[PDB]
C-alpha cells in the first residue's frame, strides 16, 4: 500500500503506557525507507519527535520511543502526562508516488485528570456597543476539566434560548479546558429587566453569575 | 537558533494565486534543502514540494498538477510557494519545513509557524473590538477586564495584552461564525486587578488578513 495507516485516536490515562501503530508497504517501507514521527500540540506548527524509526531529537523526552520491523511501526509513549495531548503523525517516503507520505494523524487524549470546577466571568455591554444600538452578554468559562459543560441564560427568572451562542471547550495552557457563551439583545431588552444570568454545568454541580444593567451606577 | 519565519494569513478568491515566503535564520540557507508541506483544516499532512536553497532544482507532488512552483532568493534567505488556480480544498495552513540528513535518509527538522491561505468569495472585514469588563469601580472585589472581538471575516484574530511594555498573561477562548456569518471572540486579562487606573493596561488584537491591528487602552464609565 502506498498510503500509511495509522488509527484515528489513541487514549491512555496518567502515567499509563500507550503505543501508536503506523502500516505501510512494498513501496515506502519495504523499499527500505525509514519511518519518522511529528507531535503537533494544539494550535501548534508539527515537530519532530522521532527520526530514523528510533532516534529522539535533543529535547525529546525519552518516554518517546520507536520502533520498525517490515513495514510495521509503532511509537510508544510511557508515563504518559496531559502535555502530550495532541495529533501524531508518521511520514516516509514512498517509490510508487515519488513523494513523501504521512499517515492519516492520531489524536491521542490523556482521560482521567483531576477534575477541575469552572471559574465564571460574566460581562454586561460595553458603552460603545450600546451607543451602537446593539448589546452583548459574554460569559467566559475557565479552568474546568473534564470538557464539557453547558450553559443556561435566563433574563430574570425566564431561560432565554433565542440569540444564544455558546463555543465548543478548548484546551488551555494549564491542560483545563475553557470556553464562552455570547447572549445578543436590544438595547430595549437589556435595559428593561431587572438581571440577566449565565448558569454553568459541569460534573453534577451548577454554577450562576448575575449582572443588572444599574450594577455600576 | 535555527528558524524559519513565515509570511502572514491571506485571502484569495477561487482561481486567483497566492505566494507565501519562508525566510530562514540560524544555519547556513544553501546547505539544507526546503520542503513545503500543507495541513487543511482537521486534515492530514500532505506534503506539496522540495526546493534545493543551493542550485534551486525542485521536485513537487504529483497532486498539484503543474499549480505549484517553489522559489528561492539566497540572498534574501526565503524560499516561496507560489500556488495558483486556487480551490476551496486549496483552504489550508502552509508550513515549510528543513531537511535534515543523518546516516541512513532525510528527516524534517525545524518547521515554520504556518500561514493560512483561505479560500473565499466573501468581503475581508477587520474586527470590531469593544472594551468589556466585569465588577465596579465599591467592594473589596475582583475587577477583570476583557476585550470582545467581533464582526471580522475570515478567521483568524491574534490577541496580546500589556501593562506598559510588558506582556500580560491572558485567557484565549474559541472562536465562533454568528448567524450573519462574521465571526466573534473574547480575550481576557488573566489576572484581576485591585487598584484599577485608566490606561495601565491595553489589548491588542491583530488580523493580519485586513492588514488591521486594533489596540484598546481606555475602559470608559459604565451607563
Ligand atoms: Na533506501
Ligand atoms: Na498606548
Known amino acids: 500500500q502506498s498510503a500509511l495507516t495509522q488509527p484515528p485516536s489513541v487514549s491512555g490515562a496518567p502515567g499509563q503506557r500507550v503505543s501508536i501503530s503506523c502500516t505501510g508497504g512494498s513501496s515506502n517501507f519495504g523499499a527500505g525507507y525509514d519511518v519518522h514521527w511529528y507531535q503537533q500540540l494544539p494550535a501548534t506548527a508539527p515537530k519532530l519527535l522521532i527520526y530514523?524509526?528510533?532516534n529522539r531529537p535533543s529535547g525529546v523526552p525519552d518516554r518517546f520511543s520507536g520502533s520498525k520491523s517490515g513495514t510495521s511501526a509503532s511509537l510508544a509513549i510511557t508515563g504518559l502526562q496531559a502535555e502530550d495531548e495532541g495529533d501524531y503523525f508518521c511520514?516516509?517516503?514512498?517509490?510508487?508516488?515519488?513523494?513523501?507520505?504521512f499517515g492519516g494523524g492520531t489524536k491521542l487524549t490523556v482521560l482521567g485528570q483531576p477534575k477541575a470546577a469552572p471559574s465564571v466571568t460574566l460581562f454586561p455591554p460595553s458603552s460603545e456597543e450600546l451607543q451602537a444600538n446593539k448589546a452583548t452578554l459574554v460569559c467566559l468559562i475557565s479552568d474546568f476539566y473534564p470538557g464539557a459543560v453547558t450553559v443556561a441564560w435566563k433574563a430574570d427568572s425566564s431561560p432565554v434560548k433565542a440569540g444564544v451562542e455558546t463555543t465548543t471547550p478548548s484546551k488551555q495552557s494549564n491542560n483545563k479546558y475553557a470556553a464562552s457563551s455570547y447572549l445578543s439583545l436590544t438595547p430595549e431588552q437589556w435595559k428593561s429587566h431587572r438581571s440577566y444570568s449565565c448558569q454553568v454545568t459541569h460534573e453534577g454541580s451548577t454554577v450562576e453569575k448575575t449582572v443588572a444593567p444599574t450594577e455600576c451606577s | 537558533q535555527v528558524q524559519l519565519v513565515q509570511s502572514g494569513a491571506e485571502v484569495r478568491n477561487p482561481g486567483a494565486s497566492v505566494k507565501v515566503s519562508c525566510k530562514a535564520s540560524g544555519y547556513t540557507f544553501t546547505s539544507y534543502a526546503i520542503h513545503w508541506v500543507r495541513q487543511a483544516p482537521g486534515h492530514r499532512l500532505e506534503w506539496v514540494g522540495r526546493i534545493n536553497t543551493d542550485n534551486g532544482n525542485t521536485k513537487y507532488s504529483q497532486k498539484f498538477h503543474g499549480r505549484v512552483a517553489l522559489s528561492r532568493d539566497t540572498s534574501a534567505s526565503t524560499t516561496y510557494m507560489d500556488l495558483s488556480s486556487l480551490n476551496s480544498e486549496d483552504t489550508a495552513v502552509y508550513y515549510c519545513?528543513?531537511?535534515?540528513?543523518?546516516?541512513?535518509?532525510?528527516?524534517?527538522?525545524?518547521w515554520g509557524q504556518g500561514a493560512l491561505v483561505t479560500v473565499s468569495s466573501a468581503p475581508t472585514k477587520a474586527p470590531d473590538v469593544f472594551p468589556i469588563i466585569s465588577g465596579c469601580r465599591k467592594d473589596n472585589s475582583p475587577v477583570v477586564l476583557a476585550c470582545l472581538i467581533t464582526g471580522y471575516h475570515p478567521t483568524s484574530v491574534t490577541v496580546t495584552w500589556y501593562m506598559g511594555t510588558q506582556s500580560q498573561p491572558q485567557r484565549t477562548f474559541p472562536e465562533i461564525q454568528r448567524r450573519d456569518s462574521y465571526y466573534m471572540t473574547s480575550s481576557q486579562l488573566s489576572t484581576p486587578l485591585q487598584q484599577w487606573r485608566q490606561g495601565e493596561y491595553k489589548c491588542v488584537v491583530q488580523h493580519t488578513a485586513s492588514k488591521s491591528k486594533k489596540e484598546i487602552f481606555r475602559w470608559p464609565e459604565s451607563p
Open positions: 519545513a528543513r531537511a535534515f540528513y543523518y546516516s541512513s535518509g532525510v528527516m524534517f527538522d525545524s
Open positions: 511520514q516516509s517516503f514512498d517509490t510508487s508516488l515519488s513523494g513523501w507520505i
Open positions: 530514523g524509526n528510533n
